[PDB]
Amino acid sequence: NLYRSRNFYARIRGDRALFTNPATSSYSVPTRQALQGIIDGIYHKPTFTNVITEVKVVNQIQTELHGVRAYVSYLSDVEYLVKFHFIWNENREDLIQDRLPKKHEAIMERSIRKGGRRDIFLGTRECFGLVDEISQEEYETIPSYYNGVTIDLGIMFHSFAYPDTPLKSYFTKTVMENGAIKFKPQSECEIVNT
């Protein structure tokens, strides 16, 4: 098959988060867009594309209100386990000389381990996230509050089209099975808006 990095696993924690529908209060769980932003914050170069395949929602979904009434609903006390990998960016063949698997996998590993190359945000400039590396064994065994049930989380924003033409948004039916949410390719999203 085409080049694919090893699977990487990251744990993301935050006291507060705000995951929104930018093509319209927080969704109850991260969107693919939000997770993409988190993982890219750990390490990204246009040579490669980070591909988020699954997230585990570890803690009970809780929100809290902030604002005035004559309004902002944030998630509270969140923990996500993210499974992802990278592939070479087909849209940047001009960077083909930098497609060095050992180099990028080493940097990714180091980057997750140190908590990311950049500050990690969970939806606002005040919602900081904390990233650390977990093993596949840990990804598989850390208990989720939602283990035992499967829950329809409804239609959620997936991502914007990429990469002139009007901006298209993709949305997806979102099911959380024993705390785990898988992310389908943009091309499989049932709902598209321009």
Tokens representing 96 are: 């083909």
We find the least distance from the C-beta atom of residue 113 to Cl ion, in angstroms, to be: 26
* Smaller CB separation from Cl ion, 2 or 68: 2
Contacts 24+ apart (CB under 8 A), 110-117: 111/42, 111/43, 112/8, 112/10, 112/42, 112/43, 116/41, 116/42, 116/43, 117/41, 117/42, 117/43
Tokens representing 154 are: 């409804």
Rg (CA), the chain: 17
We find the least distance from the C-beta atom of residue 13 to Cl ion, in angstroms, to be: 29
We find the least distance from the C-beta atom of residue 111 to Cl ion, in angstroms, to be: 21
* Smaller CB separation from Cl ion, 86 or 139: 86
The DSSP annotation for 145-170 comes to TTTT-EEEEEEEEEEE-----PPPEE
* Smaller CB separation from Cl ion, 21 or 59: 21
* Smaller CB separation from Cl ion, 107 or 155: 155
Of all residues in the shown chain, the one whose CB is closest to Cl ion is 190
We find the least distance from the C-beta atom of residue 5 to Cl ion, in angstroms, to be: 11
* Smaller CB separation from Cl ion, 22 or 154: 154
Per CB under 5 A, residues contacting Cl ion are 2-3, 88, 172-173, 190
We find the least distance from the C-beta atom of residue 169 to Cl ion, in angstroms, to be: 13
Q: What is the dihedral of CA 125, 129, 131, 136, to 10 degrees?
A: -120
